[PDB]
Design a binder for this molecule. Structure first.
Ligand SMILES: OC[C@H]1O[C@@H](O[C@@H]2[C@@H](O)[C@H](O[C@@H]3[C@@H](O)[C@@H](O[C@@H]4[C@@H](O)[C@H](O[C@@H]5[C@@H](O)[C@H](O)O[C@H](CO)[C@H]5O)O[C@H](CO)[C@H]4O)O[C@H](CO)[C@H]3O)O[C@H](CO)[C@H]2O)[C@H](O)[C@@H](O)[C@@H]1O
Ligand SMILES: *[C@H]1O[C@H](CO)[C@@H](O)[C@H](O[C@@H]2O[C@H](CO)[C@@H](O)[C@H](O[C@@H]3O[C@H](CO)[C@@H](O)[C@H](O[C@@H]4O[C@H](CO)[C@@H](O)[C@H](O)[C@H]4O)[C@H]3O)[C@H]2O)[C@H]1O
Length: 438
């Protein structure tokens, strides 16, 4: 039963309870513990059922979760959250499968991860939204990663649209770098593809600050009229402790409630970074920290005055060293096309420092244009959406064919290289593409 959490929908630049029609404001906290490299607390009832009572005391209605394991069940925890009126904002990526901001790709491997999370989590009415990326671009040196994130938003949205699932919105979470902030926010609502909502990591308010002096007034004037819901994906600067959380009074106050859809405190668990409101002891029990009462009191005080439901933008121009995100986006990764490489290529490589070494080597012998992806120029190779191993295998196979010894000896020395016997057996279009490529 999900009665206490009606699905939230988006109308204009606001969230609304789909049953009541009242504006929904996020009063949230980040909930993530640091087998899989990440820990999925929502897959383990002994963890989530310990914490929900404290989350209830805090007064939160939303958790932000950075990584789930899609191979595990989540209904116990999601139902337990619903019973307390709590929703989940969830990233689609995980640290080891996270668009690489320094070497960006939007490919079948990352897309498969995204689909897996969508198929694991979309049945829950209290799944508020998905993040298709989190601070990928983070300064003026890696703005070219943003077209890859936009492609991911488009493709996650399309995958959801074509699925039988409720049309859970797909958004983006960004940092607060002064040089890139404005351009990023415009980019994610520009042209033909838009984020559904937008979260900003917001640490401008530290200790006993004010609306005017923190920078909140400037950010609020900045986002006034923004076409999609906007909120703080993180808040809780820890410069002064115990954190007063007096920013909460401002965020849900009259001047900010008309622009922002609330925010999520960072974070629940105390870990090496010192941002918790609770600490898990040696006995796996919850010890409440000095911050907890302050957040609780502020959330309890917060009463945002909302409206009721009944009541294309130009992309930033390109400038070298300032903004290098092309409006033109990578294509939707094509699992079938890429899977036909596994079938027809003579020389294959099992997944692995070696990528950079081997691409350097192979791309000195054959033309790697077909696997390159350039977010600055909007030039994306025909097989740039395949997995890194598929891309490497393509180049190795091209070299094998160029040598033409046809002796089943693949021209790269590595235990991970093998000749593909399936290649000898008598995907038609991909074959034509690859046969053409030789
Ligand atoms: O670095 C790891 C971390 O980085 C994040 O991205 C950051 C981003 O948060 C950052 O945003 C800038 C804010 O820090 C902002 O904050 C200023 C605030 O710190 C300052 O505090 C006062 C303090 O200086 C004083 O001594 O004592 C008083 C006590 O009351 C404090 O209030 O107050 C300023 C105004 O008075 C306030 O602006 O400043 C700028 C301008 O808005 C923000 O851009 O920018 C970083 C560098 O560009 C950026 O890397 C990520 O989100 C996170 O994931 C990473 O882990
Ligand atoms: C906001 O600021 C606080 C404190 O200043 C900071 O600790 C937060 O950092 C997040 O904390 C979480 C743990 O509490 C982490 O899970 C989280 O990490 C990020 O999670 C996303 C979601 O799964 C992944 O996509 C990240 O993975 C990296 O992604 C980048 C961009 O795609 C890639 O370049 C990297 O290859 C990849 O590792 C991941 O680190 C963490 O961000 C702040 O959000």
């Amino acid at each position: 039963s999900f009665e206490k959490t009606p699905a939230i929908k988006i109308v204009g630049n606001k969230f609304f309870d789909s049953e009541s029609g009242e504006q929904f404001f996020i009063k949230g906290i980040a909930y993530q513990l640091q087998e899989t490299s990440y820990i999925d607390a929502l897959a383990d009832p002994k963890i989530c059922l310990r914490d929900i009572p404290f989350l209830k005391m805090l007064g939160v209605n939303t958790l932000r979760v950075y990584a789930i394991d899609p191979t595990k069940s989540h209904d116990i925890c999601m139902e337990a959250l619903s019973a307390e009126g709590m929703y989940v904002l969830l990233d689609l990526s995980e640290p080891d499968i996270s668009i690489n901001r320094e070497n960006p790709s939007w490919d079948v491997h990352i897309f498969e991860r995204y689909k897996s999370v969508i198929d694991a989590m979309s049945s829950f009415p209290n799944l508020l939204g998905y993040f298709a990326g989190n601070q990928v671009t983070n300064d003026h040196t890696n703005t070219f990663a943003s077209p890859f994130v936009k492609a991911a938003i488009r493709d996650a949205k399309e995958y959801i649209s074509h699925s039988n699932h409720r049309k859970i919105p797909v958004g983006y979470s960004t940092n607060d770098d002064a040089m890139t902030r404005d351009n990023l926010a415009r980019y994610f609502v520009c042209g033909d593809v838009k984020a559904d909502f937008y979260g900003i990591n917001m640490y401008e308010w530290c200790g006993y600050s004010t609306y005017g002096t923190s920078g909140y007034r400037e950010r609020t004037k900045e986002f006034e009229g923004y076409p999609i819901p906007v909120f703080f994906s993180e808040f809780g600067c820890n410069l002064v402790r115990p954190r007063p959380f007096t920013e909460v009074s401002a965020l849900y106050g009259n001047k900010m409630s008309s622009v922002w859809s609330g925010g999520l405190a960072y974070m629940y668990f105390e870990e090496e970074n010192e941002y918790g409101v609770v600490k898990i002891n040696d006995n796996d029990g919850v010890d409440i920290l000095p911050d907890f009462k302050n957040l609780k009191k502020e959330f309890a005080k917060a009463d945002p005055k909302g409206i009721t439901e009944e009541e294309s933008v130009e992309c930033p121009h390109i400038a070298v060293g300032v903004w290098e995100a092309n409006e033109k986006l990578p294509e939707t990764p094509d699992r079938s096309k890429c899977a036909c490489l596994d079938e027809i290529l003579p020389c294959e490589i099992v997944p692995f420092g070696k990528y950079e070494e081997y691409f350097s080597y192979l791309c000195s012998k054959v033309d790697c244009s077909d696997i390159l992806a350039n977010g600055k120029t909007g030039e994306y190779g025909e097989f740039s959406d395949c997995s890194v191993e598929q891309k490497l295998s393509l180049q190795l196979s091209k070299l094998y064919c160029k040598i033409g010894a046809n002796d089943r000896h693949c021209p790269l020395n590595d235990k991970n290289v093998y000749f593909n016997l399936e290649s000898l057996q008598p995907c038609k279009n991909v074959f034509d593409s690859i046969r053409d490529i030789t």
